[PDB]
RNA sequence: GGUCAAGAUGGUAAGGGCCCACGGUGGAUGCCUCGGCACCCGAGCCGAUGAAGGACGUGGCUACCUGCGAUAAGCCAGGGG
RNA sequence: ACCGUGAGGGAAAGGUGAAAAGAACCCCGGGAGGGGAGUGAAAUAGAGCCUGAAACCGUGGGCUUACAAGCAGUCACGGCC
RNA sequence: GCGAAUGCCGGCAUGAGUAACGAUAAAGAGGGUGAGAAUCCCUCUCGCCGUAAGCCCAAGGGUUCCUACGCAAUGGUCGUCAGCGUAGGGUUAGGCGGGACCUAAGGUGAAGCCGAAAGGCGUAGCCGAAGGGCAGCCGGUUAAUAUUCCGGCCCUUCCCGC
RNA sequence: GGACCCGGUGAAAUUGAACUGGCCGUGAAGAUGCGGCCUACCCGUGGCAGGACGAAAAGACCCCGUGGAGCUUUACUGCAG
RNA sequence: CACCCGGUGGAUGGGCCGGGGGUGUAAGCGCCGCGAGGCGUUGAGCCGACCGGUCCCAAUCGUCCGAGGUCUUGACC
């Protein structure tokens, strides 16, 4: 039941152009509280446990 | 400068593509946290192909850090021609478009 | 509906037991207030209070355990007996920014 | 759903089976047909 | 040297189009052969002394291919080596 | 092999090298696979590994791109390379 | 000597990172293993069956069953899980079922009867079944078997002797 | 409960090719691509159906081939009985 | 998505707290009847977003990017 389907070879050109507006953007990450290193902006980690309280491990 | 790679790599060439297209030409160590703490799969992978990269060099291609990725790319090939529901009559297979993964690591 | 609850339920349950679990953003954000709320009842502390708290949780051990046990360790404050903390990672395939929450202590 | 496949040892077998084919003119025919002609195995062989 | 008023040119590209260099993907291609095809000279019956054709079967260690079959990669006799 | 209950249909798929000397060992890695060493006339000859073209996906570079129409384009004149 | 036959064969792009996850019987938490676990193991809340989403006999399919290793692809995501890979191992009966007994349909079929040949029919006898007939049951016991292996209790047919 | 935003996977018929605007006119007589004109930046995602004479299928309704196939009777002939 | 207000020198979420609204006097003990129940305590209890207090809780800490002032003519200080 294919009522509507493309009608003209999409054009690489365009095609991609389409796929164009797309793109990524590296994690905004920051740097350790005292953990020293780069963490997920706002969180402890396999480097932390801190923040202000030792709520983790390592 | 040296380089990392690996074909017969199961994964969305495309997806992959975004991968670098980021950490792309940039400080080692640096992105080394991009893919460490970024998201979408590939990463993991991507990471990998950076370590035997940073390695290979220093080890046999030689000045650490001062390094990075003058360039990085991925290619597709080998497919995985995959069979699916017979048009409920005729076959409809997709293709997990295998995936290559090269990437430079030269020193500042 | 019956599910919203259920949750709050077992989560409220399990938690009090440990006092800080690992569910995603929201999930936690709520299990808080509620569970939270519940607390405030262990605080009220009595025939009634208990007859509620339990009403949901369903289980002497705890139910009591908290009302007596913890309750106190809180008799003083003003709600908040919980500190919902987001987390660094994310469950796979998914990619859900889970998070952890505890009884502010 | 009832396709048309439900095999029946007893059945299929019987019905078809070295013998029979044999017993027959026809059957026999093709059979030794198949035989050379092609190689392979045969019904009942199935 | 600052201010207003006008007048014209420029850089900046998310992807994009063409040209170049280097991969990948894909196998065309040439060349090649243990295989066919074709025509000519040789040859022309097997069978209960259960055939042609299979079945299950041994290799020390195993599916297949094989040659045999229970005395199963073989047992005797003569010729070649 | 495979679809057919059956009679029957009926595919695709060959190529490293002079010979393996077929990659001990060390490296990132859960591995595959990638970095060195060694065979070597050459391994972008490297294990479906001779020639290995096109289509098609990439990585950099030149030029070019936001008051603009036509697949095309081709004639003129201009600037960058 | 080829665009070109909705041509044949092979590859390769489309739509497109949108459409789908095969029943709206939901989950969530703690610990454990692992290179890596929403998707595995233990555990605790919770939901769905319940005439089934129960065990059983069959027919069909045939190692798919267990155990130790392993995840390349098949598992429409993962995956240390598998009804996936390799290796080893597993299912024993005088009394259960099939035969060593019986025939209807039907099929065969010495004789007999008719065909251009191949063939047709067809007596008796034979083939032919969860229909007839026939001598047991309960517990234990491994990673798998079990009315068969254990043991306790119950039998049948044939043979030789007296 | 999908649809939408995330992460994992990841098809499908049709399609010469294409950067495809409205107008009023036109041509083979119902044009984004031809003429004149008017609006006109480059891309996208959530949508809404109108046009691309959209997709499906070399019209079944039609006629044309001194095509075919089935039933009919005081059609032609011939056989069975 | 873009768009608006806030980011602990905060009242932004929730929490609590008063307030309203909403359900019709609760759980318990009490007192009447063999029981069923009732009557009381008790307009109780319980309260989902509505109006507003209070730093219990949770918006910590941190990054990145961003100007300089293009060419001619003249009018005035």
């Amino acid at each position: 039941a294919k009522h509507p389907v493309p009608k003209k070879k999409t054009s690489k050109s365009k095609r991609d152009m389409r796929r164009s507006h797309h793109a990524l953007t590296a994690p905004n990450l920051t740097e350790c509280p005292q953990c020293h290193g780069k963490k997920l902006s706002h969180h402890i980690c396999p480097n932390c446990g801190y923040y202000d309280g030792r709520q983790v491990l390592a | 400068e040296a380089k990392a790679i690996a074909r017969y790599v199961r994964i969305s060439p495309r997806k992959v593509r975004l991968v670098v297209d980021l950490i792309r030409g940039k400080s080692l160590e640096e992105a080394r946290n991009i893919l460490r703490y970024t998201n979408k799969r590939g990463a993991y992978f991507v990471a990998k192909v950076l370590e035997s990269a940073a390695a290979n060099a220093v080890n046999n291609h030689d000045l650490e850090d001062r390094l990075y990725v003058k360039a990085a790319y991925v290619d597709e090939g080998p497919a995985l021609k995959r069979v699916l529901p017979r048009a409920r009559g005729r076959a409809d297979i997709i293709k997990k478009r295998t995936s290559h993964i090269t990437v430079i690591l030269g020193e500042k | 509906s019956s599910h919203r609850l259920a949750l709050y339920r077992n989560q409220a349950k399990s938690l009090l037991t440990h006092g800080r679990i690992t569910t995603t953003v929201p999930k936690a954000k709520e299990l808080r207030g509620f569970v939270d709320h519940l607390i405030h009842l262990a605080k009220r502390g009595d025939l009634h209070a208990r007859r509620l708290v339990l009403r949901d949780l369903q289980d002497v051990k705890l139910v009591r355990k908290l009302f007596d046990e913890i309750a106190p360790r809180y008799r003083d404050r003003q709600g908040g007996y919980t500190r919902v903390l987001k987390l660094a990672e994310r469950r796979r395939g998914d990619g859900a920014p889970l998070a952890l929450v505890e009884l502010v202590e | 759903m009832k396709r048309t496949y439900q095999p029946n040892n007893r059945k299929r077998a019987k019905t078809h089976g070295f013998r029979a084919r044999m017993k027959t003119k026809s059957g026999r025919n093709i059979l030794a047909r198949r035989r050379a002609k092609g190689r392979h195995q045969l019904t009942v062989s199935d």
Side-chain angles (χ1 to χ4, degrees):
Chain A
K2 359 295 188 173
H3 273 114
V5 145
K7 324 338 184 86
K8 257 177 163 187
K9 173 104 319 88
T10 345
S11 176
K12 170 275 190 186
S13 33
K14 277 160 291 56
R15 265 187 190 164
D16 303 40
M17 307 289 286
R18 190 188 308 159
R19 230 181 273 124
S20 67
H21 233 147
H22 300 47
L24 296 199
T25 52
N28 320 329
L29 308 172
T30 172
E31 279 226 346
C32 254
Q34 187 184 136
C35 325
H36 299 150
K38 288 182 185 176
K39 280 182 175 177
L40 307 174
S41 47
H42 283 76
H43 289 61
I44 36 46
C45 304
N47 304 332
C48 289
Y50 271 61
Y51 275 97
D52 298 338
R54 277 186 146 195
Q55 301 198 8
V56 171
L57 271 198
Chain B
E1 87 170 38
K3 288 143 51 182
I5 210 175
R7 175 206 295 85
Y8 290 39
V9 184
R10 263 341 301 335
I11 278 202
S12 163
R14 307 172 48 165
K15 295 179 183 173
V16 195
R17 261 169 198 172
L18 250 178
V19 189
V20 306
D21 277 16
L22 189 204
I23 60 183
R24 190 163 199 78
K26 292 188 165 291
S27 154
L28 183 51
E29 174 236 20
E30 170 208 25
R32 317 176 64 195
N33 288 30
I34 314 164
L35 281 178
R36 188 213 179 193
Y37 276 128
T38 167
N39 196 30
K40 264 65 179 296
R41 190 188 296 181
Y44 173 108
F45 260 40
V46 185
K48 189 253 193 66
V49 178
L50 270 61
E51 308 315 51
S52 284
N56 209 24
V58 136
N59 281 23
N60 316 6
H61 290 239
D62 276 4
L63 265 180
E64 178 239 335
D65 85 82
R66 267 204 79 188
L67 327 211
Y68 67 80
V69 282
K70 166 193 153 199
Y73 75 121
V74 66
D75 281 346
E76 159 187 322
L80 304 307
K81 314 202 174 176
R82 257 36 276 207
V83 288
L84 295 223
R86 275 195 170 185
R88 302 154 31 297
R90 282 197 177 100
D92 319 322
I93 309 164
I94 32 28
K95 284 197 283 188
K96 321 250 198 166
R97 311 293 259 180
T98 50
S99 314
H100 294 305
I101 249 206
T102 94
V103 314
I104 274 194
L105 209 203
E107 74 185 23
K108 191 54 205 64
Chain C
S1 72
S2 325
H3 342 289
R4 296 314 227 201
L5 176 303
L7 150 288
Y8 304 152
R9 200 124 295 189
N10 108 319
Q11 291 205 341
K13 306 174 187 176
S14 299
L15 197 316
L16 292 311
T17 304
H18 316 319
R20 66 169 280 175
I21 277 301
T22 316
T23 289
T24 75
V25 168
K27 288 189 175 56
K29 259 166 176 163
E30 277 48 357
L31 191 298
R32 169 181 53 88
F34 183 31
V35 196
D36 216 1
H37 162 69
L38 265 190
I39 254 184
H40 213 270
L41 283 42
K43 302 202 321 158
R44 273 181 33 73
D46 69 356
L47 73 182
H48 279 259
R50 310 180 70 89
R51 95 226 172 287
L52 246 185
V53 173
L54 154 280
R55 219 187 185 210
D56 303 29
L57 310 201
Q58 276 194 191
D59 162 333
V60 199
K61 297 140 44 189
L62 277 176
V63 196
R64 275 188 311 7
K65 172 171 183 176
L66 164 210
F67 226 78
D68 53 302
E69 277 298 55
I70 325 301
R73 317 199 309 123
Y74 281 36
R75 206 76 87 268
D76 69 36
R77 293 205 200 181
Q78 231 90 48
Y81 314 98
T82 313
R83 61 168 64 192
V84 183
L85 317 140
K86 208 168 179 178
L87 269 306
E89 197 60 10
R90 51 197 55 252
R91 173 155 60 92
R92 255 34 22 72
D94 135 44
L98 330 172
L100 177 300
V101 191
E102 55 161 3
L103 36 62
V104 44
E105 268 308 349
Chain D
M1 151 36 63
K2 295 186 182 176
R3 295 96 88 142
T4 32
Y5 298 82
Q6 328 82 52
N8 300 203
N9 304 331
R10 276 189 183 190
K11 200 82 323 165
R12 169 141 295 162
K14 311 202 171 187
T15 68
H16 278 110
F18 286 107
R19 298 154 186 161
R21 284 189 267 192
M22 289 278 284
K23 273 175 189 166
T24 158
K25 315 240 84 175
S26 61
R28 290 193 274 174
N29 277 298
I30 278 280
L31 319 213
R33 283 187 143 207
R34 146 177 292 196
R35 307 198 83 278
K37 271 195 149 192
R39 278 191 153 217
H40 315 61
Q41 318 160 284
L42 282 174
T43 93
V44 194
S45 44
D46 26 62

